[PDB]
Ligand SMILES: O=C(O)[C@@H]1O[C@@H](O[C@H]2[C@H](O)[C@@H](NS(=O)(=O)O)[C@@H](O)O[C@@H]2COS(=O)(=O)O)[C@H](OS(=O)(=O)O)[C@@H](O)[C@@H]1O
Ligand SMILES: [Mg+2]
Ligand SMILES: [Zn+2]
Ligand SMILES: [Zn+2]
Ligand SMILES: [Zn+2]
Ligand SMILES: [Zn+2]
Ligand SMILES: [Zn+2]
């Protein structure tokens with residue numbers, strides 16, 4: 001339901017709100033520092049302390065909102081992508097069992113299944129690329145789970161396309177259309 | 186879990 005694009009608007013909102021809250025605190029700190037000139041040293045020290053804690057507290061609030069936004073989006077996108085792929089695969093397997101065989105209908109059901117696998121692959125690569133850009137240490141930690149995910153997608157898609165060559169009549173008829181679809185994937 | 190979970194050659 002364009003779930004990744006809803007995550008980008010939410011990500012942008014979060015960021016503008018953080019920038020707004022931060023500039024507000026910097027403004028308040030200027031007013032306070034100015035006012036603390038006429039006060040004793042203990043008040044000058046406390047203003048510095050209250051404002052350092054306020055900026056640190058804001059940094060932590062933003063970090064927590066980011067983390068929770070990424071987690072909620074990853075879980076939502078994975079459930080959605082799994083459901084589309086479960087359905088597109090079930091259809092493709094149903095199309096393969098038609099008597100007499102229906103090659104054009106098998107290809108139509110395969111295209112939708114390959115693309116569903118492709119979206120899962122693409123979105124996994126998009127999320128890992130983000131982590132690599134923003135947090136190399138977290139990326140190095142998740143790299144093996146990501147590559148494992150990519151291995152599952154790739155292997156399952158190959159086990160699936162193999163079923164097509166298992167019905168030689170259908171395969172010989174659509175071998176040109178499948179390879180013209182695979183090279184562009 | 187898997188192509189296996191769908192039970193393609195027998196039930197569902
Ligand atoms: O050479 C042919 O394929 C030709 O056209 C067939 O039409 C097929 C459609 O192309 C399919 N959909 S598509 O989106 O246009 O690709 C599909 O609706 O069904 C048709 C056959 O494929 S399958 O058997 O369903 O797999 C004609 O099909 S017909 O037999 O239904 O009339 C075919 O006769 C004609 O040679
Ligand atoms: Mg991401
Ligand atoms: Zn995403
Ligand atoms: Zn204060
Ligand atoms: Zn910040
Ligand atoms: Zn991020
Ligand atoms: Zn997946």
Ligand SMILES: [Zn+2]
Nearest residue numbers: 074127131142
């Ligand atoms: Zn992750």
